Design a protein around this ligand. Structure first.
Ligand SMILES: [Mg+2]
Ligand SMILES: [Mg+2]
Ligand SMILES: [Mg+2]
Ligand SMILES: [Mg+2]
Ligand SMILES: [Mg+2]
Ligand SMILES: [Mg+2]
Ligand SMILES: [Mg+2]
Ligand SMILES: [Mg+2]
Ligand SMILES: [Mg+2]
Ligand SMILES: [Mg+2]
Ligand SMILES: [Mg+2]
Ligand SMILES: [Mg+2]
Ligand SMILES: [Mg+2]
Ligand SMILES: [Mg+2]
Lengths: 63, 178, 261, 145
RNA sequence: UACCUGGUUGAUCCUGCCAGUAGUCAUAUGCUUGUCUCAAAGAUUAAGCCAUGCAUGUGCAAGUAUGAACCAAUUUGAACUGUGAAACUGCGAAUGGCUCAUUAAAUCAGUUAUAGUUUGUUUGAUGGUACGUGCUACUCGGAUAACCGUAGUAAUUCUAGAGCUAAUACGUGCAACAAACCCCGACUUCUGGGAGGGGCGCAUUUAUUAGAUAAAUCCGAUGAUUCAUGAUAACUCGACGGAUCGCACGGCCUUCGUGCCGGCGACGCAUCAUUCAAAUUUCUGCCCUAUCAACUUUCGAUGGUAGGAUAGGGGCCUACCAUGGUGGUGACGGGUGACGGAGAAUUAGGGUUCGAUUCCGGAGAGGGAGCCUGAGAAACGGCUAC
RNA sequence: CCGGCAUCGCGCUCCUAGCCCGGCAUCGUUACUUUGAAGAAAUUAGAGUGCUCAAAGCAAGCCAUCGCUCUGGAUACAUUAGCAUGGGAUAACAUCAUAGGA
RNA sequence: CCCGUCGCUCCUACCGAUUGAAUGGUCCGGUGAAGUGUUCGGAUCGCGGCGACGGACGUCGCG
RNA sequence: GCUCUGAGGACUGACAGUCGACUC
C-alpha cells in the first residue's frame, strides 16, 4: 500500500517541567503580545528555532 | 527422497543441526545404477535439471577401449570385471563402474595390429623398426583377453569407455590379481 | 524463491532512474537484454518520464508498436528494453537521434547527434578469444559479438560499430593517456585522461584519471570506458563537458546565472 | 614404487605415462612428464613438489585445485591428520561500547600437500580453493617454520 | 532546554531507594469532539476453524475451421473470401499476495567465489554430408479433440462406446560443393611417389597429441589451468541439422505454360556469448544461561583414497584405511512471549530498549512425508499417502 | 605546509624510463591513521522549489505567461569485516653469535 | 524503645508416601501407507511380412 | 544352511619358498 511511504513527523515537544511561574509567565507574555490561538503555537517556534540553532552549532564545531 | 543437502549432517563441533527448510528439489539424489555386465544392453533416459538428458547405463557388454601407446581406439566387447579398488562386492556382482579393471576382447586389436605390393612393405619396414610391445601386454594377446581399465561414468553418460593398461599401472594391477 | 522474480517495486528501482516515490507501487523492471539491468534505462522511462512523448503506460505501448522507435538502428517493439550506454535511439518520424550518455551525477541524458555522427555506435569489448574451429571472436559489454576480430584488438579495448556494415571500423587500444568516461560508482560521468593504471595480482586493476580542468580520481577497471585516443573524444560530450564540480561551484554558477538575468 | 600405497593405482589425470616417444624437456604434464603448475599470486612452486613422487588431486601445484578467492595467514594449530592441518587465525575484535579490543580466534582446516612439511605452530599462508571436504576449503601455499 | 523535586530526623549533613516530571511511527480504554490535508487499521492471544462470493488465464496479418453461427452474398467454376464463438497445440500459472510457526554462525548483513555449476526467454553471432557406390538431394501417414449420435451415475471441469476432420500436436523421411584433412590401397616404376578407388555435419563419451622462445626462423587468454581451441582414432540404436504460417505483387519467356524468378516478416530447432536469476560458497558479525564442562565417534563424527549420486564441489552416500574435530576466546545444551536486516523511540556524548509489519533476504501453507509437468516447484488458489 | 634537494642514500637489468639523469619491481608480519574505490532504495541530515503555510511532495519557473524556452530531480553519513595508496610516532608478534651471515 | 516461643485470621512459596497426573518434544526398537527407481511380467495395439491362400487365419514384424 | 571376501602366524633363504590348527 503505497501512500504508506509518505513521511510525516511532529512540529513540537511539550516542555519538561510543566508548572513553573517563570516559564509560564514568559509563555503568556509571548502569547499575549503576538496574539496566539494557544501555546502549541508558541511551542512550534521553539522547535523550529532549536532545529536551526542546533544546525548552526554543529557547523561552528567544525572549522 | 534422497538428498545432498548438508542440513542433516552434524556441525563440525558436533552439535545437532536443526532443520529449517523442507527439502528442496535442487538437492536431489537418485538411486544408483549398479551397471551390470550382460548381453542385454539397455540404457535409459532421465530428464534432469535444465530439461537436458542423462543416459543411465543399466547394463552393457559393448564398450569403446583406447590404446594410448599405439594411439588406436577400437570398439570391443566387455568380457568381465576382474578387480575393483572400492568394493569386492562390485567385482562379484559384475558392475561396470568407473576405474574398474575389465577384460576385453583383443579381437579388433589383434587384426589392427595385423594391419601395420611394393608401396605396402615400403611402409611396413618403416614401421617394425620401432615396435615396442612390452612382454607383459604381449602375453595378454596370447591369452586372448586384455586387462583394460574402464574410465567412463556408465551410470552418467550411457557408455562404457576405457583404456588398455600398460606400464606401471598394468604391472601393479596384475600383481594385485595374482 | 522457486523461480524468477518478475515484478520490481518502485523503491527498489535504482537511484539514477530518478522516478518519484509516490507514483505507484512498481517500476518497469527491465527485461533481460543487452545491458545489465542495473546500468540501464528502459524505453518507457525514455518516452514517458523524460521526453514526455506519452503520459501513461499504454501511451508508450502505442508509441512502440507504431514501430516508431529504433535502437542501435533496428526497430524495437519492447517496452522494458534495457538500453544502456551509447545506445542510439532514432525516431525517423522526427528525423531525430539521441545517444544515451551519462552526466557527471551518474544519471542518463539524451545527447543529440546528427546523422553522420549517428551512423555508428561505440562500445568496449569484454573479451576476445576463440570459438568453433578456432575462429577468434570478441564479446562486448553490449552483448554484441564480432567474428574475425582485428588481431590487434585485445580485451578492455573499445571499438566503433557501423550500423550498416555491422563490423569494426576502428578500435582504440585501452592504454594510458587516452580519455575515458566512467560508467559506475560515485565517479560515473566524469571524463578525463588516464594518468596511471596499477594492477594487483588476484583482483581489480585501477585507473587514475584527471578531469581536463585538474581534478583527479581513481576507479577500478570495471567502469572505465575509453572514448577517444588522446585527449579528443570520438563522441559529442554532454552539455557540461564531463566535469563534476563541487556543490559550492554549483552554487556560484546559479548565482552567476541569476545575476545576469 | 614408494608412493603407491593404496588399493588403487594412483596417478595424475590426463598425464600419459607409458608413451613410445619420450623426451624430458617438452612441457610438464606432456610427453609423459609429470604435471606441475604455478599457483600464481607471487607464490612459487616447491622444489620437491617439482621433482616429487607423491600424487594428490588436491595439491595446488600438482593437482586439479585452483586457488581463487581470498588468501589468509595463520599459525598451525593441529597437524594430526592425513595431509591436513588446522590453522588458528588469531585476531582482535572491536566492541563498540567499550572502545576496547578483545581477541578472538578462528580455527580453519587446511590441506597440506605432501611437498610441504609443517610442524605444530608453524606460520602458514593458505588460499581458498573449491570445497574439498565438509571442513576443508583452503590449501596451504606457504610455510614459515 | 547537558535541569531536578516530595519522603528516614527533634532538626542537620549523607548512602539510598520509593514517588514525582517528560516521550513513544506503542497498544487498550475513559470522557469529549465543528473544519481542511495526511493515513495505521485480526500482528501480540489462536501459523486455531472456516459458510459464502471473488483472487490466473490467454488470440495476433501471421499454428488448426465449410465439424455449428454472423456479415458480404455467385455469371452456381472455386471460395470459407471477411467477422468469428468452441476446441486442439503453445505459454503462464514457480510472479504477485498474506503471515512469522520453524530456526541463535544457522537464516541474514558487508564483502568473496564458481577454474566447482544450471539458466525458458531478450539481445548478438553461429548452422554442410541426414547417405550416394560422398561424382551437387531419391516421397507425402492415420487419429485426434471440438461436432454428430448412444449411455452410466445420486453425484462433480465424474465417466464408456460408435461416427467425421486438422496440425508448428504425434510419427517419418530427399539433403550443399572442392570434399579440404585422415586411414586402407590395385598396378605403375623403385618412388621423398603416381596413385585407379574404398570409408569423414554437428552434438555425446573416451583416449593419444598440439596449444610454441632465452641474450650471442615462434603465432590467443589468465594472478594461476592438462585453458580457449585445433588435429586424430573411434563411440551413440542422436535430442539436433525447417514436410510450418502471413501480407506486398513484378523485372523479364527458357516450351510465352500464376512462366525464370526473388524481397519483407512470423514461428521454431541446436551451439556459444549476454541478460534476468539461482544454487553452492570465503572471511567477519547475534541476545540471556556454568543451578549447561565436556560434546561428536558402531548407525559419517574429522580426514584420506576409490567410487556412486547430483547441474556441480562436498561424507551428499558407499567400501576400505586412519582417529580424529570442538571446547574458559563459553563448545555442547538449555531459554527466548527470537525469522535477519534497512531501520523505530529516546538521545549533550557514550548508550538503553525495540524491530510482526508494506523495501530486501529467508521460511511456510492444518502437521509431516513423497512426487509428476516444466527452464524453473519437493509447488498446495497441483497431485499421492498418513 | 610541502614539493624537491646534500652530508658518511647495498644494486638494479623490466613499464613508468632526463635537456650520463628524479622517481623501479620481488628476498618479516600486523595493529594504528590518511586518502580512494565500492558501497541498494525508502529513513536520517541537508540544498533547491510559495502544495496558501504546515506535515509534505519532487516538483516547478518566465514567456509577447501565441505553436516553447529554462530545467531540476544535488550532497552528506554508512560503526565493523573485506580491497587498495601514502605516513611510519605509538604497541604487539616474530628474530644474527655455533656465523649455515653480507 | 523493643526481642522470641505460643494462641487466632489471611496470603505466599517449601518438603511430601503417592512406580501422582496431564501436556509436548527427543532417542532406540516394532509394524509400516504411499511415491520414486528397478527385476520379472504382458491385458490390448500398431507394416496386419508369409502361405501368392478363400474382410477370415497360423506361421510375425519388431516395437 | 550353502558359497565366498577379509583380518589375525610359523619356519627357511620391507621380498621370495614351504607350512598352519584354529578364532574374529
Ligand atoms: Mg513470493
Ligand atoms: Mg518486462
Ligand atoms: Mg544523561
Ligand atoms: Mg532512620
Ligand atoms: Mg517527622
Ligand atoms: Mg517513577
Ligand atoms: Mg509474534
Ligand atoms: Mg570424489
Ligand atoms: Mg516465534
Ligand atoms: Mg517479505
Ligand atoms: Mg489456519
Ligand atoms: Mg513453498
Ligand atoms: Mg507442499
Ligand atoms: Mg487458498
Amino acid at each position: 500500500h503505497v501512500n504508506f511511504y509518505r513521511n510525516y513527523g511532529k512540529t513540537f515537544k511539550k516542555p519538561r517541567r510543566p508548572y513553573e511561574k517563570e516559564r509560564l509567565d514568559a509563555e503568556l507574555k509571548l502569547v499575549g503580545e503576538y496574539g496566539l490561538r494557544c501555546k502549541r503555537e508558541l511551542w512550534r517556534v521553539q522547535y523550529a528555532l532549536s532545529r536551526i540553532r542546533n544546525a548552526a552549532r554543529h557547523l561552528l564545531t567544525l572549522d | 527422497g534422497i538428498s545432498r543437502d548438508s542440513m542433516h549432517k552434524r556441525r563440525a563441533t558436533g552439535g545437532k543441526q536443526k532443520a529449517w527448510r523442507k527439502k528442496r528439489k535442487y538437492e536431489l539424489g537418485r538411486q544408483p545404477a549398479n551397471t551390470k555386465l550382460s548381453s542385454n544392453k539397455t540404457v535409459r533416459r532421465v530428464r534432469v535439471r535444465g530439461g537436458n538428458v542423462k543416459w543411465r547405463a543399466l547394463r552393457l557388454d559393448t564398450g569403446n577401449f583406447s590404446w594410448g601407446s599405439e594411439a588406436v581406439t577400437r570398439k570391443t566387447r566387455l568380457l568381465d570385471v576382474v578387480y575393483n579398488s572400492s568394493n569386492n562386492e562390485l567385482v562379484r556382482t559384475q558392475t561396470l563402474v568407473k576405474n574398474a579393471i575389465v577384460q576385453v576382447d583383443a579381437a579388433p586389436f589383434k587384426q589392427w595390429y595385423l594391419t601395420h605390393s611394393n608401396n605396402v612393405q615400403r611402409k611396413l619396414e618403416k614401421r617394425q623398426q620401432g615396435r615396442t610391445l612390452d612382454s607383459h601386454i604381449e602375453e595378454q594377446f596370447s591369452g586372448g583377453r586384455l586387462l583394460a581399465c574402464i574410465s567412463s561414468r556408465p551410470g552418467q553418460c550411457g557408455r562404457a569407455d576405457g583404456y588398455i593398461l600398460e606400464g606401471k599401472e598394468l604391472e601393479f594391477y596384475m600383481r594385485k590379481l595374482q | 524463491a522457486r523461480g524468477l522474480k518478475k515484478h520490481l517495486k518502485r523503491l527498489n528501482a535504482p537511484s539514477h532512474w530518478m522516478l518519484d516515490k509516490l507514483g505507484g507501487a512498481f517500476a518497469p523492471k527491465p527485461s533481460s537484454g543487452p545491458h545489465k539491468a542495473r546500468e540501464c534505462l528502459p524505453l518507457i522511462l525514455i518516452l514517458r518520464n523524460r521526453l514526455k512523448y506519452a503520459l501513461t503506460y499504454r501511451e508508450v505501448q502505442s508509441i512502440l508498436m507504431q514501430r516508431h522507435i529504433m535502437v542501435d538502428g533496428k526497430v524495437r517493439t519492447d517496452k522494458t528494453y534495457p538500453a544502456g550506454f551509447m545506445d542510439i535511439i532514432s525516431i525517423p518520424k522526427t528525423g531525430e537521434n539521441y545517444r544515451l550518455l551519462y552526466d557527471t551525477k551518474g544519471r542518463f541524458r539524451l545527447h543529440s547527434v546528427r546523422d553522420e555522427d549517428a551512423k555508428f555506435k561505440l562500445c568496449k569489448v569484454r573479451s576476445v578469444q576463440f570459438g568453433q574451429k578456432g575462429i577468434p571472436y570478441l564479446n562486448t559489454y553490449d552483448g554484441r559479438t564480432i567474428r574475425y576480430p582485428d588481431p590487434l584488438i585485445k580485451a578492455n579495448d573499445t571499438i566503433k560499430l557501423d550500423l550498416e556494415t555491422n563490423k569494426i571500423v576502428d578500435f582504440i587500444k585501452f592504454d594510458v593517456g587516452n580519455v575515458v568516461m566512467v560508467t559506475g560508482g560515485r565517479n560515473t560521468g566524469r571524463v578525463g585522461v588516464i594518468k596511471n593504471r596499477e594492477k594487483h595480482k588476484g583482483t581489480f586493476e585501477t585507473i587514475h584519471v584527471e578531469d581536463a580542468q585538474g581534478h583527479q580520481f581513481a576507479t577500478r577497471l570495471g567502469n572505465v570506458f575509453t572514448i577517444g585516443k588522446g585527449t579528443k573524444p570520438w563522441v559529442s560530450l554532454p552539455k557540461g563537458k564531463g566535469i563534476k564540480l563541487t556543490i559550492i561551484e554549483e552554487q556560484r554558477k546559479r548565482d552567476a546565472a541569476a545575476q545576469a538575468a | 614404487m614408494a608412493e603407491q600405497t593404496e588399493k588403487s593405482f594412483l596417478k595424475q589425470p590426463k598425464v600419459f605415462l607409458s608413451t613410445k616417444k619420450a623426451d624430458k624437456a617438452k612441457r610438464p604434464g606432456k610427453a609423459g612428464n609429470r604435471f606441475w603448475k604455478s599457483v600464481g599470486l607471487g607464490f612459487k612452486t616447491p622444489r620437491e613438489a617439482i621433482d616429487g613422487t607423491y600424487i594428490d588431486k588436491k595439491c595446488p601445484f600438482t593437482g586439479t585445485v585452483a586457488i581463487r578467492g581470498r588468501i589468509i595467514a595463520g599459525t598451525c594449530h593441529s597437524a594430526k591428520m592425513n595431509r591436513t592441518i588446522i590453522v588458528r587465525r588469531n585476531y582482535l575484535h572491536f566492541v563498540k561500547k567499550y572502545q576496547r579490543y578483545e581477541k578472538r580466534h578462528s580455527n580453519i582446516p587446511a590441506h597440506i600437500s605432501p611437498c610441504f612439511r609443517v610442524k605444530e605452530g608453524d606460520h602458514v599462508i593458505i588460499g581458498q580453493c573449491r570445497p574439498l571436504s565438509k571442513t576443508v576449503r583452503f590449501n596451504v601455499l606457504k610455510v614459515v617454520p
